[PDB]
Each structure stands twice: as structure tokens, then as C-alpha cells.
């Protein structure tokens, strides 16, 4: 046969974990902690570590039921295993944060159904299954809801009241994966944000990591090391914010994501030399990288100011989202970010004056606050750019 | 060729009908009536029968034009045929409910355009054609507005102002059909609810039945006998509400669905043994099945109360939808359903309290009305679980 | 290989261009002007022509940087070329309307990223790239926000604050192209109208032309000459408005679109015989075709009035859209269209009345203004159609 080929589908995987064939492997490594599974033929056991054990004390448990999937939160540790010829698939919750005494519970699936991915959010847990069903639970194990997925699930993540799902949307071809995304908000009023929409990916690539920023923005990375974030402001589009391949010292090196922060701007990941993932031991060192958006002509300070400006704007979108959600936020941050953005716009405007691109100055001033346009009028007047000062005055009258 | 294989596409079909090659077949069986096709040496004719004899008298029509597709509503009978080498594809409406006297009309389609599916709604009719176009009509045959479909249509259903369409969304593989759903509201304001979104299916299944509950909720069933209903309370997701294979006492059993009622909770279907559908004769008898959400650990009273509670919740979504559309209902139904839901929550809360899962009690109380939380506070106080009574009081203060 | 075949994907193209290997060819021809590329081994140059040179003077440019894709607006000429072993892909804007000191700017893309499609809108420009990225620019060459494309782009168009993208949504089969569309608004509030939703197409067709009505409604045409327009009044569905094959007097004829107008109702296109597109020499001439919605029984006066009525309705939907977007509009034209529609409804009602389909008269009266209903009541009274007059009176009372 001479034609193009259907791509072999990516299997489901729990985000931030390493392959099952390893005796000692990571089940989940995130901003909360690290879960290591030690599955020797001698011993099948689990090691739970918090980056702060005041959350809950360092804990080790025998993996008697042979859990293979796990998740970690501020509230609870969630564990899951497949069905066997003897067992239903089981979901085991260790709710350490409870104020009631009985801090564990287990749920057994309907008989032929298997868990394939899980995730945790504020006071709730979710599990996706081989029935192409998604099951919702409270953190205390009340069954909340059940519904059908659009296709074979790939991975899941949870943050606050947000549930982020990725699944197979069709047949991919010639190395591409046909993947779709569902994003839901589970508030007093409940919304589906993304209705199985197509998920942007690099050519001949597969999904490598998903999750949220600590600020609660959906994010993901592909096998080409391209980090993409949900741009809520820009019509819920997907903006690339970093290309990790730039820093691979040898090209067979890779970066394995651990967490994301918008403020401080931090990408937390582990450098893996000659491997797409880290070994469990000797304990890898997490590396922290800054984001850098793929702006053109970035060798110019003009491009750098544009990149810095939009990077700043994007990373502050979570404050508006939180405000719209009625979640509390530090408005001083928004004032400061606005000021930084006005300073960047003013620097770009001043440079544009010196470049004689006064039309471009008005374009930059269109993005300014009214106070910054007043300052721009004063600067332009002092610079004897009176045509620009007039144009800016008309803009100020329009604002 | 060594690759996986594209699934052969499901051919379009009228819901609640039986296959064309049968000389005697059901053109449509719904909650209104039955339409039989007789292509016999005695007579090539179509026979219409109403379940409630008071609606209209039984009617017989000679099928000279060789109609092949049909539909039935409270208002009219709709018939359609393909083009021949000489005939247009024709749409024939017999609008018996009219107050005017000239109670029929026929419309001829353009050349090379064939009707592929039809359906009836309140005062309007819709027809999808091999031009990949959808045509709309008033019940009296004014042409309403035409638009284009995303792919080859599979089936359609109408209820009130709602139009529910399913079509081929792409190429499915290895036995999966690739189906998409489009849902429109044809009120004074016209809206599109589902934008060609993917339709959930059981693996390697195909669509078997499509329609609405009598209460006007979109619903469908696949070839694996899984009934799915639109979950308006959950961001317009698809929730399974029954698995007929539990009552497939033999694997050759099948349940040929005829209609759905949320109040009383009834699935109306015909049991078929050795065939996916019944023969025309001897006249089959309607069987009633109950709904059952596929909740986990359902042998437990805890799981049973959860399943009952959420099943009750889902079936009451139609009252909210009716209210959003300005349509009315007996509010005592809503009060009673709410009360039953409170009683189920109260029983689950009492069980959780006696299990000393007091955290789970507060999680259940989160779903209670304020009066039910007050009653839960009184129960907890009378049970002398004062920590729980305190937590419930905090919740009551919060609401 | 025994199974059905995945279709090869349609290559990207600029709308209103002609194929690249033609030494003398059209780069873009729209309602603003004509741009021609003349690529001799001795001379590679581009000719710019305006349909009104007061906008700017017709201009000849030496194509030393070897641009291959281009666009034209009221404000600027946009040019683009691919990278080489020595060059980035470059975007060159000739901003002829600028009042600042230079009417040009150039942007060089990141390494190994190539421009694949471009378009212009009101004060902004957009470029889609081989990185599956969408890059936005102001008309003066600020860099605006960047995001990821759903798949390989096919073509783009812009009008006002609207940006219209089409891309490969999946793998088509047996001659079909699987295409998806994204439609975004770039106002002070930014929105996504179509979430990468499927694009309707004629069977086995491919996309031939894309753009907007001069009135600002998205429209497109496939390789079968079927013109479709976005129906904002019908939940943003796609309505066909013309089959150009009816005017293929020879059926090797084709119509190559240049522009679209709702008011006056005009399809502006070039007739091409034995080719889907015109050569640059001898200088072609535009033909104007009228729209013709594919309504049934169009040989009848009834069908003609229905076609005219809906055609009139559709071509004035933009007035409401523009008003909601704060654009100014011809209220007089809205009154004119209202009058056309009342006259057509009155004629259809009178015809139905004389055909004694009195129920259909009431159906038509539902679409009338209250004044037209009162006039219809008086007509019915004078006709002594008192039952119909009563039904119409009850409808008038209902409004």
C-alpha cells in the first residue's frame, strides 16, 4: 500500500507520571508533592511525599490492591486500579484533610468498567472510564454525576471548579493525533466551556503533559516541547508561551513538566538527558524556566517590548477570570501590571516617535489607559510631535 | 494493506421504522400511532393508525408514487419518495388537523435532489436531502428557510420548536461510526445549541433510535442498547439513563424503542428476539421498562439513594427548560420532586451520620434546600452529633 | 488497497488569485483592485491596479524579494514570501494610506516558519504560518496577539473587525475535503463565533473562493460553483444563495468570483471557459449574476414569491448585525426591505386565499407586520372570507 497511514492512537496517561514498565516510577509529581510507586517483585508499595508535610505527614502504604493510577491534592490522595478477573476496578480515596475521623473510602466500579484517568479539584474527584463515561464524586465519596465522553479519553486535570478533559476526537494521520478538548465549570451554575473543540498540536506529535497554572488556567505541552496555554481574553484560543527545545543541551534531552506559575512567571520542569522522562532515583532536580512567546524579529528591542507586553497581559488574565468567578484576588497586582504595561506601551511609543512611525504611536496609544494617553500627549508635546499630540488628544476625547 | 480500516458509514434511516426490503414494514411507530407499508399483490398501499382512536380515523392511501419515508405528529402525516428517472423526489403532506378544507399538499424537489430524512414539529416540517441541504416548511406548505449540512445526514427528530439532526461527522474507524449532532431552536428568536458537536457512542456501535422524551428532551439509543438523554442540568452533556442489555435475557434479545416518558418514568419499547426489530405481524405489544443510571456500588442502599436522587434530578430538568421557554407545568410536581430529593438526601445524610462520615453529611447537605438543612440540623442535634450540627449550621448561615 | 481512500488535502491558496506556476498571473483581484505578478527570467515584477486610483496610484514594483502571496485593502497592500536557505519568510506591508513619514514596513518570521495565507481588515493584518500559528499585526506593523491554529490552514479573509479562517479539520475521504472554520471578532470585546466548526461543502468538492459581502457577511464558494453565505438570522447556519452552474452555458465554463454585494444584490465574477480561472491577458472583464436561492417549485409564482421573500430577508440581515456592532446603516433600506416583504407576503396571502388554502394564509400572516395583518383582515373582509378574517383577527390580537 502506497497511501497515507492512520496514526496509531496515543494511550491514556495520568499527567506528570512515568512509564509503568519501570519498577520504581512516579505516579504524580506536582505542586503539592511527589507520589512514587515502588513495584519490585519483592514488594509493591507507594511512597507519598508533600513539598510541605504539614499538609499531611509523610506516608508510605503497601500497594496491596495494585493501584496503577494516582493523584494528589491539598485535600486528599486518590488511588485507582483496573478490574481484574477477580476484581472490579476500584477507586481509593485517602482524605487526609477531613475534620471527621474516617479518612479513607473506596468505590468499586460496575463490573466490566475500568478507570483510565482521574483528577482532583476543590471538594471533588473525577474518573474517566473504558465505558467512555466520566464519573464525578465528592471528595468524601458521594457519587455526584455520570455522563458520556465524546471518545477514548487521553488525560484529565482539575482545578477549583474547573474540569479539563482531552480525548480522541477522530482518526489522526501520518503521525498526527486527532484530539479534542472538553472544559467544564462545576459551580452553582454549571457550564461546558469547550464542546469537544479541536486541540492545537505540533506536526507529527503527541500530547506530553496537561494541567493548570497554579492560578487556575488550563495548559498543556506536546512531544515537541511546545507549551500552550488557554488565552481566555483572546476568545478562549490557545497561545504558545514557550519552546523548551531551545534549551536541550543535547537534542536527545527533554524537559518533563512539574508545574506552571503565571505570577511569579515560572515553568517548573525536570531536565531529562537522553530520555523523555526522569528516572525515579537518584532524585532529579527540578529546573525553573521563564516563558518566552514566539514573537517575530525578537532580536529588536521593539519585538522584545511587544513580547514582554503581551506576555505580561496574558499572565494577568487570571485576575479577571477570578473576579468574574467571584473568587478573591489582590487588585494591587492588577494595578501594578497595568502600570508595567503602560510603561511598556510608553517605551514602545517613545521609540516609535524616534522611528518617525507616529501612526504606530497612535496604534500603541489605543491600547493605553486614559492616564497613559494624557502622559503620552504631554510627552509628544515636549518632543514637538504636535501632529501626534493632536491625534492622541482626539484618542483621549474618544476614550 | 496492513493498516486499521475505515468503518463503513451507517446509512440514513427514519427513527422507529423497519427495513425497506420487507414487503410488510413499519414506516414509523411513535407515541402517536403506527404507519404500515403494504407492498403486496393485493395492494401497494400505506396504512395509518392512531393509538388513541379519538385523534383521527384510521386512513389508507394507495402508494402509487412509491413513498419510502414517513412521519406522524398530532397535526399531520408526512410522506416522501425518491426521484426516479422521471419523477422528482416528492414531499407529500396530509394535514388532517387543519380547520380549512384543502387538507393536503405536495412539493416536488429540484433535479438530482432526493429526500433522505424528514421530521415533524409543532406547525412545521423539515426535510434533509442529497444536496446536503435541509429544507423547512410550514405545516400548510409554505417554504421556510434552507441551509446546508456539515455532512451526509443520518437521521432527524422534531419536537415543539426543537429540531434535532444527526449526520456523518467524518470517517470513523475499526467499527466506530463518526457522528455529529446539530440541535436548533426555531422560536421567535432562532438559536443553534449544538454546533455539529460529536455524538457519544458505545464502542463499535451505530445509532439505533433518536427522538425526544414526551417532555421534549433530546434522546437517542445506540446499537448496544444504551439510552442517552441530553443533560440540560450539566452543560448540555449526554447522560446514559438505561442499559437495555440488562434485560436482554438472551443475547439475541433486543429492545426496539418507541417512546420515552420522564413523568411517569417510562421507556416504551418492543422486545425483539432474534432480530433487532419486530415483524409487522402478529401485532407486537408494547413493553414498559424503568430508567436506571449506571451508578457504582449499586447493591448498597447508599448507591441506590444516590442513583434515585440523581435520576429524579435529571428527569425534572424539563421543568426548568419549560420555564426558560415560558411554558407552564404544575409547580406541585416541582415541589414534590424537590421534597423527594430532600428525603433522599436526608436518608443519605442519616446513613452517613451513623457511618460517622460527618464530612459526607455536610457534602450531602450542600445539595439540600435551606428548610432541609434546618431539619438536618434538628436531626443532628437530636442524634447529639453536635460537631455535625455545628457544620450544618455554618452551611445554613452561608446560604 | 481494498478500502475507501483518504482524500489528498487541498493546498492553501489566496482567495481571488490564480496558480503560481503561471509566469503571468493574478495575485489577488477583489472589489478594491487587481494585483498581477509578471515573473520573467529577465524580470520578476508585480503590477498594482485600483478600481479607483484616487485610493492610491496604480503602481509597478520589482519583485526582488520574490513575494508570492498578496492582499489589498482601502489602506494598504500586503505582500509575503517564503523563507530560503538565506532568508526568513517575510511579510511586507505597503501602507499607502499612512500619514506618518513612510508608507511601508517589513516583518521577518522566526527561523523555519513560513507564511501560508494572509488577509487584511480594518486597521489590522493577519498571517497564518507553517508553525500552525496565527500572527496578528496592526496596519502600521505592531505585533498583536498570537495563537495556535486548529490544523493546516487553507485560506483566510478579513472585513471590519471580523477575521475568517478555514483549515483542514480532519482527513476527508473519497474526494471529500474535511474542512473546519474559525470566525472571530477583534473588537474591544473579543469573541469567537465559530469554534472550529465543520464547513459545509458539496460532495467531492473543494473550496474555490472565500471572502465577505461588501456588507460584511462571511461567504464562500466551492469547486461546484455553489455560493453559500452565513445566515446570522438563522443561528449562524450556512445558506446557499446561488448555483453558478446554471449559467455555465458551456459546461466547461466556470465563474471566478471577484466580489459579492447584498444591496444591490450582485455576484461579481469573471466567466472562464475551459479553465476554472482567467489568464491575465487579454485583460478579462467582470460579469454580474443575480442570486437565486434553490427553492422548490420555482416555476410557480408561489415558489417565486417565496424565493424572493427569503432572498430579500437574508440580504438585509446585515443591517441588524451592523446596528448591534454600532456601525451606521440605511434605516430607509430596512423600511424598503420591510415593504418588499409585506408586499410579497400580501401577494402570497392573496394567492393562497384565492387558492382557498386559508390555513396557509394564516401561516403567511404570522410573518406580517401588524399593519400588514390589519390590511389583510380588511382584504379578507372585503372578500367575505369571514372565517379567515376571524383567524387573522385572533392572530392580530395575539401580537
Curated annotation (Swiss-Prot), chains A, B, C:
Core replisome component that acts as a replication initiation factor. Binds directly to the CMG complex and functions as a hub to recruit additional proteins to the replication fork. One of its GO terms (molecular function) is DNA binding. The modification N6-acetyllysine is found at residue 251. It comes from the Eukaryota. Keywords: Acetylation, DNA-binding, Isopeptide bond, Nucleus, Phosphoprotein, Repeat, Ubl conjugation, WD repeat. The chain holds residues 421 to 819 of 1129 of the full protein. GO terms for cellular component: cytoplasm; nuclear replication fork; nucleoplasm. It is found in: Nucleus, Nucleoplasm. The gene is WDHD1. It comes from Homo sapiens (Human). This is WD repeat and HMG-box DNA-binding protein 1. Trimer. Interacts with the polymerase alpha catalytic subunit POLA1. Interacts with MCM10. Interacts with DNA2. Interacts with CDC45 and GINS2 subunit of GINS complex; these interactions associate WDHD1 with the CMG helicase complex. GO terms for biological process: DNA repair; DNA-templated DNA replication; mitotic cell cycle.
Amino acid at each position: 500500500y502506497d497511501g497515507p497511514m492512520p496514526t496509531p492512537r496515543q494511550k491514556p496517561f495520568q499527567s506528570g507520571s512515568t512509564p509503568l514498565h519501570l519498577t520504581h516510577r512516579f505516579m504524580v509529581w506536582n505542586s503539592i508533592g511527589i507520589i512514587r510507586c515502588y513495584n519490585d517483585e519483592q514488594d509493591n508499595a507507594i511512597d507519598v511525599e508533600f513539598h510541605d508535610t504539614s499538609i499531611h505527614h509523610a506516608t508510605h502504604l503497601s500497594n496491596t490492591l495494585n493501584y496503577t493510577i494516582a493523584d494528589l491534592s491539598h485535600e486528599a490522595i486518590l488511588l485507582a486500579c483496573e478490574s481484574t478477573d477477580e476484581l472490579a476496578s476500584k477507586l481509593h480515596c485517602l482524605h487526609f484533610s477531613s475534620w471527621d475521623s474516617s479518612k479513607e473510602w473506596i468505590i468499586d466500579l460496575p463490573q466490566n468498567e475500568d478507570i483510565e484517568a482521574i483528577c482532583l479539584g476543590q471538594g471533588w474527584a473525577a474518573a474517566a472510564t473504558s465505558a467512555l463515561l466520566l464519573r464525578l464524586f465528592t471528595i468524601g465519596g458521594v457519587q455526584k454525576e455520570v455522563f458520556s465522553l465524546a471518545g477514548p479519553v487521553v488525560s484529565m486535570a482539575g482545578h477549583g471548579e474547573q474540569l479539563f478533559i482531552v480525548y480522541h476526537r477522530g482518526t489522526g494521520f501520518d503521525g498526527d493525533q486527532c484530539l479534542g478538548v472538553q472544559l467544564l465549570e462545576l459551580g452553582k451554575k454549571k457550564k461546558q466551556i469547550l464542546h469537544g473543540d479541536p486541540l492545537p498540536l505540533t506536526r507529527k506529535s503527541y500530547l506530553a503533559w496537561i494541567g493548570f497554572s497554579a492560578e487556575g488556567t488550563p495548559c498543556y505541552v506536546d512531544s515537541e516541547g511546545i507549551v500552550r496555554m488557554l488565552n481566555r481574553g483572546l476568545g478562549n484560543t490557545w497561545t504558545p508561551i514557550c519552546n523548551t527545545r531551545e534549551h536541550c543541551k543535547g537534542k536527545s534531552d527533554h524537559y518533563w513538566v512539574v508545574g506552571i506559575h503565571e505570577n511569579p512567571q515560572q515553568l517548573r520542569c525536570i531536565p531529562c538527558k537522553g530520555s523523555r522522562f526522569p528516572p525515579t532515583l537518584p532524585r532529579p532536580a527540578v529546573a525553573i524556566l521563564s516563558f518566552k512567546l514566539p514573537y517575530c524579529q525578537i532580536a529588536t528591542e521593539k519585538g522584545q517590548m511587544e513580547e514582554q507586553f503581551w506576555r505580561s497581559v496574558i499572565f494577568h488574565n487570571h485576575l479577571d477570570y477570578l473576579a468574574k468567578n467571584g473568587y478573591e484576588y489582590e487588585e494591587s497586582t492588577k494595578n501594578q501590571a497595568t502600570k508595567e504595561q503602560q510603561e511598556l506601551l510608553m517605551k514602545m511609543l517613545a521609540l516609535s516617535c524616534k522611528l518617525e512611525r507616529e501612526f504606530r504611536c497612535v496604534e500603541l496609544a489605543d491600547l493605553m489607559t486614559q492616564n497613559a494617553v494624557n502622559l503620552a500627549i504631554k510627552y509628544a508635546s515636549r518632543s514637538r510631535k504636535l501632529i501626534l499630540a493632536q491625534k492622541l488628544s482626539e484618542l483621549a476625547v474618544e476614550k
